[PDB]
Amino acid sequence: SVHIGAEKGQIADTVLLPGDPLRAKFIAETYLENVECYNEVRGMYGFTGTYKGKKISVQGTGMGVPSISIYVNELIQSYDVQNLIRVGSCGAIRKDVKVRDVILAMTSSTDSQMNRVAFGSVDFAPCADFELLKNAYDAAKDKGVPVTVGSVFTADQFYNDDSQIEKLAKYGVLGVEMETTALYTLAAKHGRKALSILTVSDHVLTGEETTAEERQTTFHDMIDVALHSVS
Amino acid sequence: SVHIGAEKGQIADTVLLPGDPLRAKFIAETYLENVECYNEVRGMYGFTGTYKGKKISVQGTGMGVPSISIYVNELIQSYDVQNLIRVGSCGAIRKDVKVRDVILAMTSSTDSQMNRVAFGSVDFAPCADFELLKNAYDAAKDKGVPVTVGSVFTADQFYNDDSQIEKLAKYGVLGVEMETTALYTLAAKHGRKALSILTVSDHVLTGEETTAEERQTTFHDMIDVALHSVS
Amino acid sequence: SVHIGAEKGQIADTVLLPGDPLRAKFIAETYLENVECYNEVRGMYGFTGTYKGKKISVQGTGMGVPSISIYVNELIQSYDVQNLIRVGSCGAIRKDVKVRDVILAMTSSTDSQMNRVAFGSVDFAPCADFELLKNAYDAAKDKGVPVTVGSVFTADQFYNDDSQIEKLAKYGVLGVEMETTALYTLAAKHGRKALSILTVSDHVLTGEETTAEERQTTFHDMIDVALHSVS
Amino acid sequence: SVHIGAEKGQIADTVLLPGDPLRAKFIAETYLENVECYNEVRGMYGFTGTYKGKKISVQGTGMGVPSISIYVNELIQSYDVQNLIRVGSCGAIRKDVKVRDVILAMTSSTDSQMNRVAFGSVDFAPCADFELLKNAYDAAKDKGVPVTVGSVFTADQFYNDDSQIEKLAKYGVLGVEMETTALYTLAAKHGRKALSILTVSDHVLTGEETTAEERQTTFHDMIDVALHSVS
Amino acid sequence: SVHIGAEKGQIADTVLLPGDPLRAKFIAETYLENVECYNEVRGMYGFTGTYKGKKISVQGTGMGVPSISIYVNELIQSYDVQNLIRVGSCGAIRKDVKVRDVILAMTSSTDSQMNRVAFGSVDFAPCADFELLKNAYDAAKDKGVPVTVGSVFTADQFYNDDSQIEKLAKYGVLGVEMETTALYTLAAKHGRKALSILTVSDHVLTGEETTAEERQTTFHDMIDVALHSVS
Amino acid sequence: SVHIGAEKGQIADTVLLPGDPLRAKFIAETYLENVECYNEVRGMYGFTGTYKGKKISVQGTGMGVPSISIYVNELIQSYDVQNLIRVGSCGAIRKDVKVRDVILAMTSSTDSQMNRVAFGSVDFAPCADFELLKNAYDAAKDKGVPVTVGSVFTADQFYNDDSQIEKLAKYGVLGVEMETTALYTLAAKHGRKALSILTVSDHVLTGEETTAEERQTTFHDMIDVALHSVS
Ligand SMILES: Nc1nc2c(ncn2COC(CO)CO)c(=O)[nH]1
Ligand SMILES: Nc1nc2c(ncn2COC(CO)CO)c(=O)[nH]1
Ligand SMILES: Nc1nc2c(ncn2COC(CO)CO)c(=O)[nH]1
Ligand SMILES: Nc1nc2c(ncn2COC(CO)CO)c(=O)[nH]1
Ligand SMILES: Nc1nc2c(ncn2COC(CO)CO)c(=O)[nH]1
Ligand SMILES: Nc1nc2c(ncn2COC(CO)CO)c(=O)[nH]1
Ligand SMILES: [Cl-]
Ligand SMILES: [Cl-]
Ligand SMILES: [Cl-]
Ligand SMILES: [Cl-]
Ligand SMILES: [Cl-]
Ligand SMILES: [Cl-]
Ligand SMILES: [Cl-]
Ligand SMILES: [Cl-]
Ligand SMILES: [Cl-]
Ligand SMILES: [Cl-]
Ligand SMILES: [Cl-]
Ligand SMILES: [Cl-]
Ligand SMILES: [Cl-]
Ligand SMILES: [Cl-]
Ligand SMILES: [Cl-]
Ligand SMILES: [Cl-]
Ligand SMILES: [Cl-]
Ligand SMILES: [Cl-]
Ligand SMILES: [Cl-]
Ligand SMILES: [Cl-]
Ligand SMILES: [Cl-]
Ligand SMILES: [Cl-]
Ligand SMILES: [Cl-]
Ligand SMILES: [Cl-]
Ligand SMILES: [Cl-]
Ligand SMILES: [Cl-]
Ligand SMILES: [Cl-]
Ligand SMILES: [Cl-]
Ligand SMILES: [Cl-]
Ligand SMILES: [Cl-]
């Protein structure tokens, strides 16, 4: 494929999708055995290893709908990937979303035009694969990892002078990130299974930061949940 | 409220929401004990009775986003309703949606302008309450009722010369009805819990009808699932 | 047809279209002779009788563009209906619209997406049939019934947090209801004749109610005008 | 005003609005007595004279929504004009619109963004003043001038690669011109009375021309009707 | 062509495009030798003469996208015009745009729907012909005429209650006029070369007028630059 | 700043903006002296060195409007960057765009919603800084580097089922990339100077590739032009 330097069979059926390629490296090296790096193009690293004797890949996506769409399209079309699980963070937009909560996104709102380009007057609501989502939910509940299931907002502008997060929060949306709408829409368009699992980076509307320690803990929880979502 | 003739406390915390008021009557009389009719305004009947010693209401909504929005807004704002569960049907738009499947909607796409009126350039993705959805899913699985969890499309035009159901089906959408986007959006806007449980009326793209017998069976399954979704 | 249980010839060339099926019943029983009920599906009653020896039908439409569109499409396509006259109410949005005025709608604005779904960048302006409108106007003037001819707004949201009625009133729009755009657009698309005749339910921007007595009087005036609009 | 060189009281309460300033000249000189030219700015002539002892003005508008909007805004705001009557032509888009028919526009569709700029998600339907329209209709009927009352389309692009006139004709729209939406919207916004009276220039969808003789006749009919629309 | 009364070869390869036909007359008579008027239709004069022994035409366009689009389309399609140079004015929307600056428009924003009608979800950015623009820039610099190169806004509404000029100015837009988007888009669509050269009529956001003397000077500068932009 | 790990003064007044961080590294190491890497966050490298004794930075942007917007916003707001020059490639959409042409973008069209989010009904046309563009043009012409000045299209979807490149090419657009609209809009919004200089990656509509050798040559030409655009 144009943006991924891998060969046939180098990428697993299941791929974890962090935004940051240095986090892709950290995940593969920390969690997986027998790791190979299959992609270095643009420094957007992808790796394959095993977790409990099963092949798992981890591929950086970059930031924003256009970047993740490139990787997701190529993973699906050129490498026949079946399960695509974004592991990332989001800015919480509600007080009831606690700093330790792991978020499972059922769906996402967006200000991307990607779906209006396809559907015009239709509002297309992307949808997580329920099997993946339920497995992740079960894995969290089994261990006592706090988990919140709901919707997120996929933003094009990290710095948005016209942000509607205040109104989105009132409609129940949990947090803002920059990827889910693309992952969910493209996976479904191709009959593959997708899920986004997210930690909280901060509360955007209070400016209130999460601490390095909190972030480390939630990151590990997210990855543990991810490594129990297929099947 | 303007469209519902009920008094304080006449409507339960939990309301089932069929589109047809004659089905509301059928549900209450067939499934509930100690039934009172609290509303006859416009013949859009609403009833309250008990199921296993717990108060449950059943309120007809009429057809289409504008009609259900009236009832949902009044139930929430004037009667403090907490759980709102649509029980209806949809036209299946995929072969893999079988005539006997009970559909739990995680979200819905729409050609209604209701959310663009509020959000403009944002595509708002409505979201089912996961607690209700999971309870319904569990209730179906416990009994062996076939259940499919995914998205639906909320149409304004039952007869639509410009229908995009072919493309929607390719993106994984299961079926078409005329209510879910409104129920989900309005419940969330007011911090209440909503879920749509749907049977298949026909396969729209093959014209292939469901039989009266199939419809009777799936209807009963839907109601049984509904009467186990709260808690 | 899918939503109307009538047989061939049971519905007249001319159909009055109240939103409330209990008002359809009231109209037919109060004004017509030799009345039969041809439809009970969903309790959305339709009746046929005679007025001065001429067949006239009265069919409830439900509330909102999607509901009336179902009935109007089926009346036209399955029953070959020629003249379709909505008889209903609207919330007045101008002081100069008096509580006793009968409104004849020349056209309607809307926040429904129904016409953008068909036309995209075009603003489609629906148009009353001038022959029906002029007959109704003549009938009102002949008796001294106060009549105001102008435009209305067809709303999807009876409860609209983003209402533009203040600006609409400044542009001369008379009142808000939930049906006209659909009736006018669908009748014209099929080469049939349509008109909406409306009474005032209240002044929305002053909250000021109309009294039961005023409403009874204007209702009778509206029906009398309606029963003189064909020919 | 910026684009009209007239002084206080030089423009009458009633102004006829042809698109072509050379037609404004022709109308005033052919139909009115005691004519003065009050405007020569940009060669967009305006004239005032009397018809049966009553002051009448005739002001060229130029072609297209932006041009007519300039003149209409200045006539209303700077010269306190009360009645604004466009007299022009349109391309017929239906066979049933005959070459000799004088068209009275109840409303107009458009591809101009002028009303979406003001209203966003609302489709604003402009509305003729019914008093002017009815007077014009009466004047035509009194003399036996064939008259057709319905809607038109206000186009921004005389040469439009993306024209929807075929679909507009199916929805009953009579003909295409480039002014009415602006005249009707701006007059109503300012509480003034407007009407467009139109002849047929050709049948756009058959290319079939109207002859010079036909055009002369219909032009005179249009002006005669116009000079009987106020009161 | 429909709106231009000229014969084959009467219009030059290069046409200057003022909005006001009386300015077209003034330009041709003041600057060119051996002038013929080739068009008087609608009083929208067009002239051809020579400048330094080379044929040059000057054609009034009227005001607004729809009017200029008519002339530009006919000049290109019926008369094979190659170079189209608008010479007009604009209202400056920034303090840094000085009253004596001659503006060369690289591109223009708009509230016209003309390009959304063609492209839907795409924002089409019109583009000046760089060869013409560079020649004009060189001609200004050679003589010491102050010149500013940047973008303008093409407005449909000279009187716009919903104007966004304040925000446009913040994004760097220089001034507002009513033509450029159409000229640039239509010329490019047909493989011809276009440029808009503009003087400042006033500062719209300070109301501060330019004086008659300033306007005379800048007008002459604009025309001198124009008569050195081809080649 | 959130995504860039640099300290005060580590980034120059002038920054080159390749999409690929490994190309940022290649540019700085190949062309500049005394190079320091100031950013390794997300592996999106940024470097500062000197070219002919003047400080120059080179910062990877990632792919797509959302990614470049993050870097451009932080460079401007946190590091006070003055001149921002994207150096990248695009897919040519016209035969007349030759494989060796260096493209200077005057403006860009887009299917990103970023500007509709800010402006709604306005089509915002981004604009290159003419001073930078002219310097780059002069530098190319001085050496005989073939240069083409015109517009590009900024795409959100590298793989777009609904691509309009065929129509865009007919309107004169040169090529497709994924960044320019954001760079130009954000630089102008903040009063900074921007330019995109682009090579041809392939002809998208003929599939016809550029060779490795051609790409190496054009890359060097682009960088040489870039290192002569300020002043
Ligand atoms: N728009 C937004 N995105 C957030 C936020 N927090 C975490 N993310 C997700 O990370 C971004 C890159 O910084 C997308 O990959 C936030 O507050 N706002
Ligand atoms: N638009 C659509 N709606 C469907 C269909 N089947 C079942 N419903 C849901 O019932 C309607 C009323 O007939 C909404 O209340 C269908 O095929 N298409
Ligand atoms: N949106 C709106 N609709 C009105 C109003 N008054 C009368 N109607 C018309 O009745 C409704 C149902 O209540 C449509 O059938 C009003 O104030 N607002
Ligand atoms: N778009 C369009 N406009 C028409 C037509 N015929 C008559 N007009 C109205 O005249 C125009 C100028 O030529 C508007 O003033 C037609 O066929 N198409
Ligand atoms: N909308 C606008 N247009 C301006 C302005 N100044 C000069 N023009 C350009 O002239 C107009 C006609 O008056 C278009 O031909 C202004 O301030 N606003
Ligand atoms: N959409 C598109 N983008 C192109 C193309 N060629 C070069 N680019 C620019 O590179 C991309 C990443 O591959 C944006 O950074 C192309 O053909 N199509
Ligand atoms: Cl690689
Ligand atoms: Cl495996
Ligand atoms: Cl992330
Ligand atoms: Cl945002
Ligand atoms: Cl908000
Ligand atoms: Cl009641
Ligand atoms: Cl109870
Ligand atoms: Cl239903
Ligand atoms: Cl549909
Ligand atoms: Cl489709
Ligand atoms: Cl029946
Ligand atoms: Cl009869
Ligand atoms: Cl009603
Ligand atoms: Cl409203
Ligand atoms: Cl308002
Ligand atoms: Cl004058
Ligand atoms: Cl008088
Ligand atoms: Cl005309
Ligand atoms: Cl058209
Ligand atoms: Cl069409
Ligand atoms: Cl002529
Ligand atoms: Cl010559
Ligand atoms: Cl001008
Ligand atoms: Cl403006
Ligand atoms: Cl603004
Ligand atoms: Cl760093
Ligand atoms: Cl330096
Ligand atoms: Cl690139
Ligand atoms: Cl594309
Ligand atoms: Cl195309």
Provide a descriptive summary of the structure in words:
The structure is a homohexamer of 231-residue chains. With 231 residues, chain A is of the alpha/beta class. Chain A has a single domain (1-231), classed as Rossmann fold (3-Layer(aba) Sandwich). Helices cover 33% and strands 28% of the residues of chain A. Chain A is built from seven helices and nine strands; from the N terminus they run E-H-E-E-E-H-E-E-H-H-E-H-E-H-E-H. The first copy, chain A, has helices at 21-31, 65-79, 114-119, 130-143, 165-170, 180-189, 212-226, and strands spanning 14-17, 33-39, 46-51, 54-59, 83-92, 102-110, 147-154, 175-177, 193-203. Chain A has a five-stranded mixed beta barrel. In chain A, strand 7 (147-154), helix 5 (165-170) and strand 8 form a beta-alpha-beta unit. In chain A, helix 2 runs parallel beside helix 6 and helix 4 crosses helix 7. The longest helix of chain A has 15 residues, at 65-79. The two termini of chain A are 28 Å apart. Chains in contact: A-B, A-C, A-E, A-F, B-C, B-D, B-F, C-D, C-E, D-E, D-F, E-F. Chains A and B meet through strand 6, helix 3, helix 4, strand 7 and helix 5 of A and strand 6, helix 3, helix 4, strand 7 and helix 5 of B.
